[PDB]
Design a binder for this molecule. Structure first.
Ligand code: CB3
Ligand code: CB3
Ligand code: TMP
Ligand code: TMP
Lengths: 264, 264
C-alpha cells in the first residue's frame, strides 16, 4: 500500500543502525504516524500476499481472552509457536489484559465490554481506551505487548481508532497489525451501528531487520494493487460471537508472497 | 512555536464540532504528531507568556510520587485546585502510578527507577516505557491521565521520548505538556550522560474549546520569537533530587500572556 511502502523507504533512507534484543541488528527510526481511511478500502498489503487466516484467527483469539496457543493450533495458525512454553502458554498477554485485567483488590476488568458501553452511552468520551500494558504483570509475559494501547473516537457517525505500537517489525509484523486493527474497527462499528472512519497507526521504534533487506528491496519494486473490500456477512449478537466464516475479503489480488525469517 | 501554531490552524480548518464531558463544546481532530528537536532549543511557546513556575513544580511534584496538592500550594501553584477533594487529594494520578504502581500481589513498582536502570544497562531496549494508565485504579482518579503513556529511545548517543496524549486542550494544556516532557528528557539525559534528541508528541482527541476562539485568533496573529535555551546548573545525585533553582531558562522573550478560562 502507498503509506506502507513510503514507510519502508523512509526507514531505509533515514534509519540508523541499532543493535536489538534478538541479536539480529536493525535499521530504526523513532516516531511515525500514518492514517488509513477505512472507507477507501480494507488496508491489507497487496505488494506481497498476506495470510488472512492467521490474521483473522489471532484477533478472534485475543477477543476470547485466550493466551494459550491451542486454539491457534486447532486452526492451523503457527505464528505464536516460538514464544510459547511447553504447555503452549504465553502468560497474561493481549487477550488476558483485554478481557480480564486483574486489579489490586481482586477484581478483573473486561476492557472490551467497558468500551462497548462507552461507545453506546458516551460516544463523545475522550477516554475510550484499551491498554495491554499492565506494568504489574509484565514479568510474566512471554513478550511485552508491542501493540500496547489504543483509543476509539466518534465524530459525525464514524468510528476511528488510534493504535500506539512501541516496537514495529515493518516487514513481518506491520502488515498483520494494520489489518488486525482495521478488522476490529469494522467489528466494533457494526456492533455499535456506526460507519468506519480512520485507522491511525503510531509507531515508537519502527525498524527493518538486517536479514530482511533483500526482501524489502524486492517488495519496493512492486506496484500496489487496488485495495480489497471487507464484507461482514452476519451481525452476531455480540463482539465475542464472530466466526472466521463471517468475513469475506473481496477483490484481493496480491503479488506473490515473500518468505522472511522471524527474529526470536 | 511554528509546529504549535500550525496545529492551532489545522484544528480551526479541519476540526469538527464535538460535544464534550465539560459541556463547553470543542472543535476536534483525531490523531496528530509533531516532533521537536531539543538541540534546536527548549520548546516553550513564545507567542504567549507561559508560567514556568507552574510547569517546573508540577513535574517535580510528579517525580516525588505525590498526588496531594499541598506541595503545589506551598509553592504558589494553583493549576490543580479545581479537581482536588476537600483534603487536597486527586487520587492515584500521575505521580502515584509513576513511582508506586500497585500490583495484584501487593507490590509497588517504581517505573522511573526501572527506566533509569534500562537506560543505563539496556539502552537499545524497545520497552523503555512509563504508563499512568492503570485500568484497575481509574475509578479512584479525579481525572483520567491525559498524558497517559511515554517511551524513551536511544540512538547515536541521544535520548528521544515519545508521549501519547489521549486528550489535548491545545490552547491551555498543550504548551505546559510540551515543556513538561521536554524538561524530563533533559533531566533524564543528564542523569544518564546522554545528549538530548527529539521529543515526539502524539495526540488522540486534539481540540480547541469553543470559549478559546478569540484567544486563538489573537495568538495566531503573532510571530514566534527564537526559542530559549535550557540550562541545568547542577547535576543532582539522582533524578529525584532536582530543585526549582537548578533550572535556568535563558533568552525567553515571549509576547504577552493571554487569559482563558479552563473547562472543568
Ligand atoms: C504482528 C503480528 C503477529 N505475530 C506475532 C509476532 C511475534 C514475534 C515477532 N517477532 C519479530 N521479530 N517480528 C514480528 O513481527 C513478530 C510477530 C506474527 C509472527 C510471525 C509472523 C510470520 O512469520 N508471518 C509470515 C508467515 C505466515 C504464515 O504463513 O504462517 C509472513 O510471511 O507473513 C506473522 C505474525
Ligand atoms: C497541561 C497541564 C497541567 N494542568 C492540569 C489541567 C487540568 C485540567 C484541565 N482541563 C482542561 N479542560 N484543559 C486543561 O488543559 C487542563 C489542565 C493545567 C491546568 C490549568 C492551567 C491554566 O489555567 N493555566 C493558565 C494560568 C496559569 C497561571 O498563571 O496560574 C495559563 O494561562 O496557562 C495550566 C495547566
Ligand atoms: C507481537 C508483535 C511483535 N512485533 C515485533 C516488533 C519487534 O521487532 C519484535 C518484538 O521485540 P521487542 O520486544 O524487543 O520489541 O516483534 C510486531 O511488529 N508486531 C507485533 O504485533
Ligand atoms: C491534565 C491535562 C488535561 N488536559 C485537558 C485535555 C482535556 O481538554 C481535559 C481533560 O478532559 P477529558 O478527560 O474529558 O479528556 O483537560 C490537557 O490537555 N493536558 C493535561 O495534562
Amino acid at each position: 500500500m502507498k503509506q506502507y511502502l513510503e514507510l519502508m523507504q523512509k526507514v531505509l533512507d533515514e534509519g540508523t543502525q541499532k543493535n536489538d534484543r534478538t541479536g539480529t541488528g536493525t535499521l530504526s527510526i523513532f516516531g511515525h504516524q500514518m492514517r488509513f481511511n477505512l472507507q477507501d478500502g480494507f488496508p491489507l498489503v497487496t505488494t506481497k500476499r498476506c495470510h488472512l487466516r492467521s490474521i483473522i484467527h489471532e484477533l478472534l483469539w485475543f477477543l476470547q481472552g485466550d493466551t494459550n496457543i491451542a486454539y491457534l493450533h486447532e486452526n492451523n495458525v503457527t505464528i505464536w509457536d516460538e514464544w510459547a512454553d511447553e504447555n503452549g502458554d504465553l502468560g497474561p498477554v493481549f487477550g488476558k489484559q483485554w478481557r480480564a485485567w486483574p486489579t489490586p483488590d481482586g477484581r478483573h476488568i473486561d476492557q472490551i465490554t467497558t468500551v462497548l458501553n462507552q461507545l453506546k452511552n458516551d460516544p463523545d468520551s475522550r477516554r475510550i481506551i484499551v491498554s495491554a500494558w499492565n506494568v504489574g504483570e509484565l514479568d510474566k509475559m512471554a513478550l511485552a505487548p508491542c501493540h500496547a494501547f489504543f483509543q476509539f473516537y466518534v465524530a459525525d457517525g464514524k468510528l476511528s481508532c488510534q493504535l500506539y505500537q512501541r516496537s514495529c517489525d515493518v516487514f513481518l509484523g506491520l502488515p498483520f497489525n494494520i489489518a488486525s486493527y482495521a478488522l476490529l474497527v469494522h467489528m466494533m462499528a457494526q456492533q455499535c451501528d456506526l460507519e468506519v472512519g480512520d485507522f491511525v497507526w503510531t509507531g515508537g521504534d519502527t525498524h527493518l531487520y538486517s536479514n530482511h533487506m533483500d526482501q524489502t528491496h524486492l517488495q519496493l519494486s512492486r506496484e500496489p494493487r487496488p485495495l480489497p473490500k471487507l464484507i461482514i456477512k452476519r451481525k452476531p449478537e455480540s463482539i465475542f460471537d464472530y466466526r472466521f466464516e463471517d468475513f469475506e475479503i473481496e477483490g484481493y489480488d496480491p503479488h506473490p508472497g515473500i518468505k522472511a525469517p522471524v527474529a526470536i
